[PDB]
Write a protein that binds this DNA or RNA. Structure first.
Ligand SMILES: [Mg+2]
Length: 49
RNA sequence: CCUGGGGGGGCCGGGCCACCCCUCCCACGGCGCGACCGCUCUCCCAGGGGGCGGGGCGGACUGUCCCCAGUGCGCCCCGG
């Protein structure tokens, strides 16, 4: 008797950045530089201590 | 003018260009001064370093781990 399908409400809400974005090349290179620089200090402290 | 013939000159004005004396517009060449669009780097500072910088509104992220230090992204107003 009622085969037709009604159109659902299109009303939506604002979107949030739910998923993490990719870090840029500058951020990746800064992470690499930090990992390189903060490694030598560990062995330096272990040697002088 | 020369020996009837031979040789040469002016008329025929007016109009255009141009030899000497001032302006207007296009195409091309360079320089200086302002506006519009896009993207951005040396001058600046406590040589090196901070790279395109200052501030704010918010979020996210990094460290064989000095709990402090450091880098992107969204928007807005300035600097170059
Ligand atoms: Mg010109």
């Amino acid at each position: 008797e009622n085969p037709v399908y009604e159109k659902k409400p299109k009303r939506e809400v604002k979107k949030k950045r739910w998923n993490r974005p990719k870090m840029s090349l500058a951020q990746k290179k800064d992470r690499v530089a930090q990992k390189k620089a903060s490694f030598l200090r560990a062995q330096e402290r272990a040697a002088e201590s």
